Write a protein that binds this ligand. Structure first.
Ligand SMILES: Nc1ncnc2c1ncn2[C@@H]1O[C@H](COP(=O)(O)O)[C@@H](O)[C@H]1O
Ligand SMILES: Nc1ncnc2c1ncn2[C@@H]1O[C@H](COP(=O)(O)O)[C@@H](O)[C@H]1O
Ligand SMILES: Nc1ncnc2c1ncn2[C@@H]1O[C@H](COP(=O)(O)O)[C@@H](O)[C@H]1O
Ligand SMILES: Nc1ncnc2c1ncn2[C@@H]1O[C@H](COP(=O)(O)O)[C@@H](O)[C@H]1O
Ligand SMILES: O=P(O)(O)OC[C@H]1O[C@](O)(CO)[C@@H](O)[C@@H]1O
Ligand SMILES: O=P(O)(O)OC[C@H]1O[C@](O)(CO)[C@@H](O)[C@@H]1O
Ligand SMILES: O=P(O)(O)OC[C@H]1O[C@](O)(CO)[C@@H](O)[C@@H]1O
Ligand SMILES: O=P(O)(O)OC[C@H]1O[C@](O)(CO)[C@@H](O)[C@@H]1O
Ligand SMILES: [Mg+2]
Ligand SMILES: [Mg+2]
Ligand SMILES: [Mg+2]
Ligand SMILES: [Mg+2]
Lengths: 316, 316, 316, 316
């Protein structure tokens, strides 16, 4: 008769103790947890406009609560044109890259939406600026996401693993429900917006055909595409398979953004033992040039991402 | 200011007053609302097994709260083999066909799931049995669904229209947010599990390729397929387009069941002003033989459903 | 299993059905329930000024949700100088006298506060005015209160009895927990603000000393006085004893007001089977002259109220 | 658009950093916060028996969640006859003395009830036992209480002050609403169960008379006595005055218990700058002999406790 032993607050504080931290990253991670519970509650009474305004309130809660951690120096949002450089009084050493509410366009239809964040330690000697945001994702300290779906889950990936925490909204505590999550090696679902079929490169084309009409005449792959990144990525982690948003007429730049959509999700993928590629390079090694830079991303189970990379290599 | 101006309790009772009834259907409709609020509650914590534990809880909540309205004589659940005949002391004159929790499968992946219902009046003077449930959905008195997605919505369709109500979980009250919902004439999203492409009839095949490669220089349609009927159908109703679960050889009579999944959603679509076909006949005119009868279903905006029906007819 | 077996929505509508009414009082009684759930919500956060901000919010919620029932023609609030006459487009036939939030004072000290109401039918064919509210509480159609204490309870008394309903805030539903509540004949707790002992008439003085020093070797009565009428009266109803707010020179007509505090609680007490006197006449038989008229009140178990009334009569 | 800057988690972690703690007392204080939110939620749906069973669940949540902190070695509850000595694997260095749910007898009447806790650092070299609980309250590290009233508040008193945190139940976060709370020097309310008037010593008797018929002929003191300790003590802290539960026929032992009712509350009182006396000695200096030992307590504003101590001294 308990609150199932490992709550998020407890877990973060123990992992901060084991790593002999200053308590600055714990304060930061405690602040993202308060922010996500305030966004989950606002998402759930979705109006008692509400896309533009709920995305605005979400932006405002993540920025104000993160400044209050006294742990950040630069903040990058999908919503703000330029980076937020924190006030010298509130400055800590972390750079945080976030999407306060992914899939806002889907709010009206009531589709699962989510918050995506990546945390970097500030590296330079220089007075904080946009430049400190621009590290490859290989340099991420912690990264993860909250999914506001049928229930709200937080997936936190750090250096040592991926852990899933389910909000108990009755007490406002995230409980550890799944630990050291590893993705399947080969799954059975492919996920892409097939309305772009005529824009696709010939490797993506060949692959999709291979999943629908398997040459070895095994069972085809199911298709699922919620059209909300956190939800398609999350389903992939749990059930297995591949998620694709390649280059097509959105240039070989693609739609999703590197710093706050692709990199957090790629870090979660490599940590649960899967892959994240642009088709050419690993997403985590790309050196950013802009904070709102976009990148192709293909991620998911290992044996499904390698099979497509083989087709990519066959078209060279 | 207020809680809302029109609640599902104010609305339901106002309509029973305008309609001049003994208050029995009102009781049934208020019992449905208590049941939805309770399942929403259980769905939003989920785990503080998931799948075949929550849908068992949901079966239980609905059966129990409906017998207590003293308004039902026959209940048909997805979960139960046979039609439940209510004890005479609790019998009323209605037959309710329901899906306790659609897409329960998806609890682990946290995808939008929902509750589906249709209410038929008993009209057959004889001791109530399965018999009374085997009516064409053209005979529905009321139908609708509750969607547990990023927020909870109850959509209810009756004689006079389709109305959408958002749950405010802070006060446990459904508030009318959308009045006399009517679907767009032509949409721009098609929704089908393309992984069955190996098995699709040619009318479905010409349609999808015309959606991906328009003969003229149209923008192709976007594709979305959550894999949960209430979420896909709700997006359709709200934003336009078409949802198809055609006949294919793995489940050659379609997958979805007529009484509790197909008919409520066909009725909601027809009152919103869109179409719902088998491909050969309309879903609402089919007469059941079995309470668990499956049926094919193509539904959505009138112009796009028509455009596929012509292709069905083009194959003769 | 269920949400509950009998909800305040099931009960209210079942009674309107048994009673054979146009469903107008039902609408009013369902509007009261929405209003109580919303104030409970605001009372339980309190501060995320308190006092004259929350009671202003509560005044607002009640007036607004009652006009919207289209069931009220005159409203009397503690908060407003004059009786509010409802616009003809929203007028119905009832007069509601209410205290939006009793004991608002105590929000800072976090003591149990409550909402008090009495409903009178208009019976006076003339354009509605204050006039219609100035009826003896013997004329009440329904009365009761909501108590925001450790849990929320709504107690409603009508013709046929007093029933207690507990709010389940998880589903926003009031569940019948106590049916046909009847008060104990003799209690063992007296409740008065003894700091006015300098000003009390001698009948009150002989009573209290007989409670503290029984002439025989009885156990003396315990004393409790929360200082919030709904909490003191609720304890009385539920556990027995007497609550006294006698006449004294600072407020010589008593403090508590007849229409919205005294009469509802006198009516609840009389249907629970206890007594409610001024000391000289019963509170329910007094005819108002002013909507904000004050009145003395002694109420509780029949044997203890009697025992003080004899001492009043012993002084002649 | 925030979660009003200083949440309890943030405050505790900063104060743990400033004191260069190991993070063991932060883990303990984070665990009492989870426990209090799980008890507040259970208290608020008070049954959807429930006195004996809710006090039992409360006991079980505080013990299981405190063991899980890995910060305690001995636990003393009102509910357990003997002290709980923790398992060597879960052992930390703190002794915690608590009342999991004060005022449970009042649950049926819906009176404010609360949780009271005192934390001691274990002092001996010896294998932990009842003996480590038995320190004077002068040796308390931290002490405080949660009040489940109109809203839920946590009052935390530590070496440097008293801070009041209001639960925002919407997000499950305690927000700092009042800091470095100091009690008034003289208030205007006295609080005692006057049903014991004939059991009272002559100093308590003289005092009460002095408050009701003030010799200097100033204004009498109001009386308030909820009969729930956390609620009478809390009202005293905020509004001022005195709270008394002296010796009478419950011997010069009194009813309230030293380790978990009186000492936490006395520590809060001295820290907000008031007094807590048995009439003879300060409650914080008493050397306990038993864990379930009782003690007289008189606490509140300074100028009111000294005035009574003068009367105590006059009766010698
Ligand atoms: N939960 C955590 N809290 C704080 N630091 C952590 C955590 N997990 C890992 N770390 C390591 O802790 C150092 C950060 O310390 P500081 O920024 O003073 O809190 C880094 O070496 C991160 O790798
Ligand atoms: N909100 C409603 N309440 C009750 N009956 C309704 C409602 N809306 C439509 N009806 C019509 O009311 C009749 C049901 O009355 P009864 O079964 O006595 O409650 C039917 O003719 C339904 O078409
Ligand atoms: N639950 C209830 N709903 C409606 N009216 C009720 C209820 N309980 C008692 N009544 C009686 O119903 C009549 C009110 O009918 P009407 O004003 O058309 O709604 C009155 O005679 C009240 O005494
Ligand atoms: N919030 C707090 N967290 C931990 N220790 C605290 C706190 N506030 C004061 N202390 C001091 O911290 C020491 C406890 O350290 P430790 O038990 O390793 O956590 C003691 O000297 C307490 O006085
Ligand atoms: O380009 P489309 O088909 O409109 O899909 C966009 C959606 O897909 C994603 O890129 C990935 O789910 C979302 O971030 C976005 O809302
Ligand atoms: O995953 P599949 O085989 O495409 O089936 C999807 C269908 O099955 C369900 O998940 C359950 O019937 C529906 O919600 C959905 O339309
Ligand atoms: O504090 P006093 O003067 O005894 O007055 C108490 C009375 O006033 C109120 O707090 C407000 O009318 C009542 O709830 C209560 O019965
Ligand atoms: O002795 P009495 O009058 O029953 O009062 C007991 C109540 O008073 C207190 O001792 C102090 O409020 C409570 O702990 C307890 O429930
Ligand atoms: Mg995005
Ligand atoms: Mg189904
Ligand atoms: Mg009042
Ligand atoms: Mg106690």
């Amino acid at each position: 008769f308990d609150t199932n032993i490992v709550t998020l607050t407890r877990f973060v504080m123990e992992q901060g103790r084991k790593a002999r931290g200053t308590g600055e990253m714990t304060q930061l991670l405690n602040s993202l947890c308060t922010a996500v519970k305030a966004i989950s509650t606002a998402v759930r009474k979705a109006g008692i406009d509400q896309v533009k305004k709920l995305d605005v309130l979400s932006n405002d809660l993540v920025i104000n609560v993160l400044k209050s951690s006294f742990a950040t120096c630069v903040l990058v949002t999908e919503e703000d044109k330029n980076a937020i450089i924190v006030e010298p009084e509130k400055r800590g050493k972390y750079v945080v890259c976030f999407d306060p509410l992914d899939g806002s366009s889907n709010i009206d239809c009531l589709v699962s939406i989510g918050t995506i964040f990546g945390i970097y330690r500030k590296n330079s000697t220089d007075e904080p600026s946009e430049k400190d945001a621009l590290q490859p994702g290989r340099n991420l300290v912690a990264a993860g996401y909250a999914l506001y779906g049928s229930a709200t889950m937080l997936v936190l990936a750090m250096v040592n693993g991926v852990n899933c925490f389910m909000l108990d909204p009755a007490i406002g505590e995230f409980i550890l429900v799944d630990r050291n999550v590893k993705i399947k090696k080969k799954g059975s679902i492919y996920s892409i917006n097939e309305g772009y079929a005529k824009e696709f490169d010939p490797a993506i084309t060949e692959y999709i055909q291979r999943k629908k009409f398997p040459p070895d005449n095994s069972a085809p792959y199911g298709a699922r595409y919620v059209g909300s990144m956190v939800a398609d990525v999350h389903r992939t982690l749990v059930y297995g398979g591949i998620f694709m948003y390649p280059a097509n007429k959105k240039s070989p730049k693609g739609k999703l953004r590197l710093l706050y959509e692709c990199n957090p999700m790629a870090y979660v993928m490599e940590k649960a033992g899967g892959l994240a590629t642009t088709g050419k390079e690993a997403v985590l090694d790309i050196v950013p040039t802009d904070i709102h830079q976009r990148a192709p991303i293909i991620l998911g189970s290992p044996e499904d991402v390698t099979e497509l990379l083989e087709i990519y290599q066959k078209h060279a």
